Fold this sequence. Notes:
Four copies of one chain form a homotetramer.
Chain A: H1 19-26, E1 30-35, E2 45-48, E3 57-61, H2 65-72, E4 76-80, E5 96-100, E6 103-105, E7 110-123, E8 126-137, E9 139-141, H3 142-157, E10 169-174, E11 182-185, H4 194-197, E12 206-208, E13 214-219
Parallel strand pairs in A: 3-5, 7-13
Antiparallel strand pairs in A: 1-4, 2-3, 4-6, 7-8, 9-12, 10-11, 10-13
Amino acid sequence: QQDPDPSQLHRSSLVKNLQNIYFLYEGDPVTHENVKSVDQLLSHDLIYNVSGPNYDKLKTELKNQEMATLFKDKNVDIYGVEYYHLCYLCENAERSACIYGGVTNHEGNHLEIPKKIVVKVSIDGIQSLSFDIETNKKMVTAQELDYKVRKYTIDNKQLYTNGPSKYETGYIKFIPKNKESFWFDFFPEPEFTQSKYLMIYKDNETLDNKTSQIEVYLTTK
Amino acid sequence: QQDPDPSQLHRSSLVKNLQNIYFLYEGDPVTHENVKSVDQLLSHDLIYNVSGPNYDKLKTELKNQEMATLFKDKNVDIYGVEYYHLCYLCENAERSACIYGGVTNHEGNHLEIPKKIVVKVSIDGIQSLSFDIETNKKMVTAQELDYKVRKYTIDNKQLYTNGPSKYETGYIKFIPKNKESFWFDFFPEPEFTQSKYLMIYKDNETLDNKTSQIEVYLTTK
Amino acid sequence: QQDPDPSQLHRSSLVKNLQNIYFLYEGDPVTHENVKSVDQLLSHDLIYNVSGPNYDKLKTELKNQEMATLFKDKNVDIYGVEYYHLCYLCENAERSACIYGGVTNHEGNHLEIPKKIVVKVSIDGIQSLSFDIETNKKMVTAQELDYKVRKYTIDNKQLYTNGPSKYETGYIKFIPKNKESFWFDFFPEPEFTQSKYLMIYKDNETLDNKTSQIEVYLTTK
Amino acid sequence: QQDPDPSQLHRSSLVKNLQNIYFLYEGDPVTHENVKSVDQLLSHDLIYNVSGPNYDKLKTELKNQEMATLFKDKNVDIYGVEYYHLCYLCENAERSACIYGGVTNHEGNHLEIPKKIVVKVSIDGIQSLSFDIETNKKMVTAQELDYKVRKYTIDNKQLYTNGPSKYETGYIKFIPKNKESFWFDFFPEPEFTQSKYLMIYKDNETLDNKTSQIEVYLTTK
Lengths: 221, 221, 221, 221
């Protein structure tokens, strides 16, 4: 998925209700360890009886029925950026949260020593700096890492606010060692929803954290 | 409103998902001072551009169009028990909260010193102890008084928990000076939703707090 | 009930999307004979696996838990005014229909030949129209008779159109023999929902069709 | 669409509620000629003030923001398989219908005489039948042609029933003179929703009806 050409990046200043992007990235992510599914709603999601602040039932929509049946009877670890508005999990659940992807096998995936990852960060075409992020998994979802990056960038250089952004465009690029690199745009469409926007994590793309690489590109104005 | 015949109270051991009542009275209420509505969905509701931890638009459903148009353009104070599940306010709002009633005119309703109200509590027929709640309004909603009552007994007598209750039945009774006593059952029907249950606050019933009385009847059954 | 003051009646000229009331009463009602409930979502409702043009699951919301368990294991006949928008039944049902009340015991309730009931229509204080409706039930819901009456004047006197009504106010008055008269206002509040408006049927009010009388009062403009 | 691998096809006998695919193709399609969008909910959709039975507001979801804006101000023709369950268009619309794609420019896309297209059907490896479908458009969406192929095989060869299908697997393959051939699975995943399934039409794929071929492949258990 070679890189976006300028015109291909969503312009933050046309976005309406941009704060709903901020709330996803400024808050805490959903994280659970050594859990196993207890039901599913469609054939391509799995439902977990886990709890966090604001929820006690968590649904994740994966790539298709084959990925879901895969993880269904497996103890896994989860790390997702959740939403509530338009989250659908069970007719009787009043405190549910939803994510896409963020699923990995627990058995064996744990790192005693946490791998630190360099985040090369560019602005208006020049590298302005970098920062490290850390993960405890040998094989991590690209989602878990895109979040740690945006959370840091939000609180350190105001990537998102409860309001307008400073940057016009932005995307994060995951350059695996092995195949095709791939990117995510930091801004949604003018009129969007948190659930449609997060579909970027639905592919459950997981990648070797010792070998991969992370680049971020932003523009001002 | 004749007091509950015993076969008229809801049995807690029959409630599915009773923990959803717990979250309502254990968490903080929604409060705003001297605010004005900015819109409405239906004729009997009012929408406020106000914020709290998980929302930034708040809707109150009042008794009928009459009552909503009565407060529509007034500066009011809001004291309410809010819900998110099944809360509908606007097609574009992704961070909404909803309540029933809880509205009092702001201007001239403030007490300079809080008024204590004695709350008598009975368990299996015996007067077991009294505690006080407080309010800053001369005219307060039964709702504000009911929430403070239930918050205090959830954290001190374990009225509710994330799971079953010590108690089989319970209700709170208001005895106004000027008129008819009324009461609210502390447990919903077996299969309920928080929005349906909170409708006890829809009529926006308000009391003179200097002269109101509160009694609570709980059974251990 | 006390007959309505003109100030109590809703002015149709104030209604937004009045055409939503038209579709309810121009369309076929939902009817089924000798059936029994198979489930329920909440305690005040009953679900029937019965079919019509556009649905294969039908939910009826009754007065309270008491009334729903009263009819839960009985063979009943159903006669309702249904809606789709905001109809909630089951997470797995994509073709649902919803009504309020309209439920009657089937055993012994059928009449050999239809019982005709006269409907007196006053327009602006002058009663120069009479028409009949008929039912196959000895104890019929007000709902059934009311649909009957509104369907007839929608097509005969243009009570409703896909647009405004030539009538400003209008209401139907049921007059039982033995007990209390009561009425339904033909127009809803300015901004409403079909689900909200149809609650006039939730109490499942049933009467003797041999003896009950019907009057309708409309005002032009 | 690389032609399907036998393991890539969805087996109809695993599907829960296959009748919900049946009602989409046995029912009439939504068709409108020379209409112009009027609004939009999200950037990738367009809403049309058009009617049909059961609806008076129609929404189509296209590929993305660029596609909605391409047709936004255009007079277009619409031909789509509509759904109601989980269709959202507006907070005030109680009668809406939704589709994916199905949009073609109106201007000079019409044909004096319907183009007749021969449909090649194979069943378990042998081509046992050919029938004709027809379109009035020069450039027609694949959606429109699939609808006609399917309405035909439902009514004549039992492709779908209010119950299971006579076929275990099924797909339709489109072969455009020029570029890449593509195909659609006649069957959904086991637990599905109509809304998710119909996304096979979201990309609004369109082809020249004079030079595109339709081929149908079915297997029995």
